């Protein structure tokens, strides 16, 4: 007899057991070496979908600019970024008609939020491309460095505290003939650059291979932007989020229970609205080259139309971000490694010296890549990337565009209606008609409409089936029963601060993963068991009666023998594990307090214990946690 795991699906629906097909126990793929190859591939692909557009030379930076919008309509099924402005405006106007006053209300809301916003908000972001050193650094560090640099050049807008003066200083910096900044060469130094170089650096992008991405055989590159545009992208995203919140078909921003509720409600609404005797079909789609095909100029037009009835200054403020993105420049990374096997020698060619050697010495793939990149290359090692949205960062605005595309609902008064849900690069399109052939006709019309707006539905990865079952952002729906949001369950290991706050963090993460993400009771209890095992192994504080031997474990055993009331002991001191689903949120020390005897309880709760020492407001709370300032709140060396 030969076992066959897939035979399980014979007796159980695939959706019910979809978790079996997710290999999340394996080591996620990781990229080795340079990311320049993938960045060049992204640049080439972005320029390929738009080469038929208008090509010119920028008069501010001297880069090569490719503009596909208002270009010739596509004639094949390949990805097309030749979006038409008129159609985008029509879609936005229709969405306005379906949502009267929504655009201006959202613009006002975002504008007032931007008034009240302060510069410190910029510190809430993730890694950002600091230009003073040209590297990815924490948002706070980049903000501090840029503020100091602006101080050196008589730009003291950030002093006012508001985000408006900071962004005003940002734009005015582009006007300075020369800029002085603090660099690291390691020691601190002052360095001066010219206006064009500063403009290029501000518009520049850092590129790196995405690591630990699941479900993708080949790696792909991702982009981090500078600190200059963070305010403008923030306000644009706030505006787009305000619009999305009021859009029924927007699969954002809430996640979890509201996600399943939205899926089910959309499905039910769609069934109910079906003409009698007709049919409803659902298309699970995936957008190929979603980032590449979208054009920043289309987003500029979107912002201009959204702020139709808003003050001129706010219109300019919204419009800045698309302008900078449309002129973005991409850094190509670390370069390429050339090796002679006979001599066992290797040498790294950085991006500026990419063409310093004849292309014959490169492999075929890199040879073709560089040959196609030549025109868009710059002497300093960066590439012009006027089209495309490599960094993303317009998830809300892109979602707005997708929803607007979904809002047409009909073409030429044909006998079919279509609606659905859109979230970033994923979507589900429901179509009702009299027969499946008409539904496919409507889906073809939707595909053409999406082509028209710069969105390319992927024919290889999308599919259609009678309404009732589908997939959306890893959420599988089948006759009401939504399977789950398949997410990488994390390592319930040692959080890594101290003895007590460690346990607090562990139990809090278990509770949150239970309450926000999908995890049932038995899974959570096994999670608690695994975390306690890892905790005891890491701190070598196994149970007092546990015959494991060790340096500290010897004194732990001595305590166990000495102890009279063993029920009230912390696992850090070899005590029994008491945590469960009920008492997940309560700190262990308070749980056991009633049980612990004074003989050891007094020592644990020593006011002037020699371990914790001087404390800080961050120390006890820093995510936040609950704990007791006992003997298990010590710090590092």
């Amino acid at each position: 007899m030969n076992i066959n795991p897939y035979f399980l699906f014979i007796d159980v629906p695939i959706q019910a057991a979809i978790s079996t097909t997710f290999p999340y126990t394996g080591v996620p793929p990781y990229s080795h070496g340079t990311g320049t190859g993938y960045t060049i591939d992204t640049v080439i692909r972005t320029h390929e979908y738009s080469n038929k557009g208008k090509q010119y030379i920028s008069d501010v930076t001297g880069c090569t600019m490719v503009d596909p919008t208002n270009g010739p309509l596509p004639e094949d099924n390949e990805p097309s970024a030749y979006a038409q402005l008129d159609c985008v405006l029509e879609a936005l106007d229709r969405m306005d008609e379906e949502h009267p006053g929504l655009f201006q209300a959202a613009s006002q809301n975002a504008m007032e939020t931007l008034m009240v916003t302060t510069v410190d908000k910029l510190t809430q972001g993730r890694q950002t491309f600091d230009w003073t050193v040209c590297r990815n650094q924490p948002a706070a560090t980049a903000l501090n460095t840029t503020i100091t640099s602006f101080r050196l050049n008589d730009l003291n807008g950030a002093d006012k505290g508001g985000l408006i003066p900071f962004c005003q200083d940002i734009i005015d910096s582009l006007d300075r003939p020369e800029m002085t900044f603090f660099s690291v060469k390691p020691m601190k130094v002052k360095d001066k650059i010219t206006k064009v170089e500063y403009i290029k650096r501000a518009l520049s992008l850092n590129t790196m291979t995405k690591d630990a991405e699941r479900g993708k055989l080949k790696r792909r590159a991702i982009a981090t932007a500078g600190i200059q545009i963070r305010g403008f992208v923030l306000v644009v995203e706030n505006l787009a989020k305000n619009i999305c919140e009021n859009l029924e078909q927007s699969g954002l921003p809430v996640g979890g229970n509201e996600k399943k509720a939205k899926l089910s409600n959309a499905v039910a609404k769609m069934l109910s609205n079906c003409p009698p005797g007709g049919i409803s079909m659902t298309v699970t789609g995936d957008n190929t080259k979603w980032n590449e095909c979208l054009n920043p100029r289309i987003f500029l037009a979107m912002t201009e139309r959204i702020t139709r009835d808003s003050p001129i200054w706010f219109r300019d403020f919204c419009s800045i971000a698309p302008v900078l993105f449309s002129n973005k420049i991409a850094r190509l990374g670390k370069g390429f490694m050339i090796t002679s096997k006979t001599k066992r020698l290797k040498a790294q060619i950085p991006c500026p010296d990419l063409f310093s050697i004849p292309l014959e010495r490169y492999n075929e793939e890199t040879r073709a890549k560089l040959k196609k990149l030549k025109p868009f290359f710059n002497e300093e090692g960066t590439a012009s990337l006027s089209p495309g949205m490599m960094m993303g960062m317009f998830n809300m605005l892109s979602t707005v565009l997708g929803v607007a595309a979904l809002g047409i609902k009909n073409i030429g008064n044909k006998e079919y209606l279509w609606d659905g849900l859109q979230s970033s690069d994923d979507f589900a399109l429901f179509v009702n008609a009299k027969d499946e052939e008409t539904c496919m006709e409507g889906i073809n019309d939707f595909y053409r409409t999406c082509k028209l707006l710069g969105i390319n539905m992927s024919k290889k990865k999308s599919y259609c089936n009678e309404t009732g079952m589908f997939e959306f952002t890893s959420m599988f729906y089948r006759d009401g029963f939504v399977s789950n949001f398949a997410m990488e369950l994390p390592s319930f290991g040692v959080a890594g601060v101290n003895e007590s706050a460690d346990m607090a963090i562990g139990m809090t993460i278990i509770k949150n993963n239970m309450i926000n993400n999908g995890m049932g009771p038995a899974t959570a209890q096994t999670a608690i068991q695994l975390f306690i095992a890892d905790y005891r192994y890491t701190y070598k504080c196994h149970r007092g009666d546990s015959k494991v031997e060790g340096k500290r474990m010897k004194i732990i055993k001595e305590l166990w023998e000495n102890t009279k009331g063993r029920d009230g002991l912390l696992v850090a001191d070899g005590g029994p594990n008491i945590y469960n689903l009920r008492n997940l949120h309560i700190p262990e020390i308070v749980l056991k307090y009633n049980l612990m005897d004074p003989e050891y309880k007094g020592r644990l709760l020593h006011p002037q214990n020699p371990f914790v020492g001087h404390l800080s407001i961050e120390g006890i709370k820093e995510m936040d946690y609950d704990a007791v300032s006992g003997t298990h709140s010590w710090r590092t060396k």
């Binding site: 809430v254 979890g256 890594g496 004074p598 007094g602 002037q608 214990n609 020699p610 007791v628 590092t636």
Partner: protein
Amino acid sequence: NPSLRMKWAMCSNFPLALTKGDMANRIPLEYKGIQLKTNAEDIGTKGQMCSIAAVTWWNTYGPIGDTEGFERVYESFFLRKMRLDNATWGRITFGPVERVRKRVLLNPLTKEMPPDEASNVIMEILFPKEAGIPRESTWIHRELIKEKREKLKGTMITPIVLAYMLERELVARRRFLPVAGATSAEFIEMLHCLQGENWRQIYHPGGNKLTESRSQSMIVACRKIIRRSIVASNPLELAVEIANKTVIDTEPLKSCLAAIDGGDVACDIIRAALGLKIRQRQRFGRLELKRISGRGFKNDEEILIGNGTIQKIGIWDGEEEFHVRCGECRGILKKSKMKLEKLLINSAKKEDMRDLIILCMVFSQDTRMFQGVRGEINFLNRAGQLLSPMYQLQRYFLNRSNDLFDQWGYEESPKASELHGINESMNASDYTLKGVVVTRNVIDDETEKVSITKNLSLIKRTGEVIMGANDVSELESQAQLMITYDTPKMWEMGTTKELVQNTYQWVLKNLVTLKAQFLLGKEDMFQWDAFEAFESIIPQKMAGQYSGFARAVLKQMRDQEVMKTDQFIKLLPFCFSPPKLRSNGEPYQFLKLVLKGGGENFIEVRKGSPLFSYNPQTEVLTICGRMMSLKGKIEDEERNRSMGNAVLAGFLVSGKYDPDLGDFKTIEELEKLKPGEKANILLYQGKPVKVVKRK
């Protein structure tokens, strides 16, 4: 990597930052060859580094510092733990649950404050001298300030911890979480256990130290009595025996039941079983009826349910009026053949009236209720017997309320001023459930003797059933007082540790009788109720093998006089279950017997376990950490013979450790041995022995 960063700190001589002064030097430089602190001449920081095991030394021999007022400092956590402790747990239901994202104030607060106002008040509480310029929130919030001054006075804890806890109890911490019908602040802290994505759990946080301690204790006691009785055959005798041999920490349960006219159903059932006075009223679960007018007849016939199944039911036909009540909310019900004529209720907690109305619906046997069933209705009971159809519908619709509300249909509410409708969520509206109306003129709410039958059902003098064994509410809770019981049959309620302690105490106390009966050589000494209770914690798969091994070892012990009290006591409890020998006909063999719960829950057959240990030097029996003396039943020859002849079946000692014969032999080969062959075994580290198989 943060996680890895400290797995190597322990390898360091001193990874922690020691303080300076007396407490720095309280821990010695070294202790039993383990370093704790050091005298390192730092450059300019005067710093001192302390080890990791030093915390253990502080816990063991460290100075016993003053802990006064600690509970007051952490009042928030203590209140949280008391809310959890004083809570009561209801049923757990499986089905669709709809949760909505909301900003729901994760934790509670003594008084909600803005962060700056909270910081000001905190600065006042801890350091009035250093508060600086007087402020205004100091003026208005004088009451809380004064209370906290009165509370945190005299504590030696570091002021930073006091300030942090004050901020915790003052500064709000709001987050977006999913909630389904539980929005109170007390509920969010347990929201993780409240309900998942496919199930719901009923949670009732405790309030204050409620005065109804005795009633709350006897209710749960009687509920457990019923739960234990129902599963066992002939619940009558077992239930009455249990209720007669139960004491609420000072007095028998019967005296309390007579004294207080409390309880809902379980107390009534127990009172009838014991022959006491109970109130006269019909029950159908949480809802009680009191007929006022009309009469009906019971006819058995088949009906069709919405899900499409046929099952016989005894329906009641005829006009009837009932003074229906549920929990606290009162009302009146009109019932007829498959119709709900009219229903009147009062104002109360939303859940109380919801339970009331749904119970009326299910009891009414309205055709709409038959058609309001979608899922399977095969619910089971604790005993594993299929529930009666009416109780099956009751449970199904209690677990599923929206379906019946949707199916029933609505109508217009009356125009009377005091009469108004209610929606699915008990919201006043013109559209009201047909025959259901709210009212403001509250209706006002004496003992007799009732007989009992085998199935714990109350039947009146004429024979009508008044209380059913299925009406017991499944609201599990913890008694406020330390109740105690004497019967072995119910020892399974306590933890496996407690059960083992109780059974070992029982066997020890009457050891003389057990030995006297065992010397005779019958089998009725293995059927004691204590061993019946003990068999619960033994795993079923290995229970037969354990019992076979125990019987074989005891028989070998008796045949050849190597009688040892310790082993007899240890292995007697396992002899109940029927023997399960191997295909060869020889009993299984073991090194340690594992019980339910795993881990510590194991009894060692050779040396001793945490649940059972013996010290022959002092003749002390340590059961589960409790020490007893076995003087008067231990013989000197018993002290001589240590353990060699009572560990293995059909084997006896013949010599001492012989390395030439070989190393210690494992069970896998011991079972395969042939008569007339000598092997070597190990009792525990440093005490090897030699044994030989005997036919």
